[PDB]
Write a protein that binds this ligand. Structure first.
Ligand code: SAM
Ligand code: MG
Length: 156
């Protein structure tokens, strides 16, 4: 089995602000690349009423959490998990893509996004500047003692 692996979730306030910044609404399909405990797709479904939210995650410890959290939050009808490497998972149906990634995956991520996402798709990232792209918005989010940066991109 896969042993314990540390992770970094996005604080709840930053999750909300990300979805606000991307103007997430009911008609949206939200994909979270590396969804961890599922909080972004759960909040999108629970608080922003999205028709569909899909979390992609490779770590089974995280997936087990996320699956339970979906039930605990009463959003099993609209939120789901895809087990896999998000580089290898089809995200083309997304109208909004969220990311909080702490490794240098920029060079790899850019071509998959341009290839699979339709023009007008919004990409919103927590402290992940996408090198070579021009952000529509760069927003500082104050979170108690903590500060965060959120980037918004619009495909095309
Ligand atoms: C920084 S945590 C963020 C979790 C969540 N999106 C949030 O903001 O609260 C990054 C997550 O991405 C997952 N991850 C990293 N690389 C991945 C990959 N290639 N495919 C799927 N998941 C990945 C990790 O296992 C971890 O759960
Ligand atoms: Mg932060």
């Amino acid at each position: 089995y896969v042993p314990h692996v540390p992770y970094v979730p996005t604080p709840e306030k930053v999750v909300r602000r990300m979805l606000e910044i991307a103007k997430v609404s009911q008609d949206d399909i939200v994909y979270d690349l590396g969804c961890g405990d599922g909080r972004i797709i759960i909040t999108a479904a629970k608080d922003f009423n999205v028709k569909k939210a899909v979390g992609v995650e490779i770590n089974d410890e995280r997936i087990r959490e996320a699956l339970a959290n979906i039930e605990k939050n009463g959003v099993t009808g609209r939120a789901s998990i895809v087990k896999g490497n998000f580089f290898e998972v089809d995200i083309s149906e997304a109208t909004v893509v969220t990311m909080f990634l702490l490794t240098n995956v920029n060079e790899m991520l850019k071509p998959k996004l341009e290839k699979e996402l339709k023009p007008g798709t919004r990409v919103v990232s927590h402290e992940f500047e996408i090198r070579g792209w021009n952000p529509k918005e760069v927003i500082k989010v104050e979170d108690g003692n903590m500060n965060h940066t959120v980037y918004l991109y619009v495909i095309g």
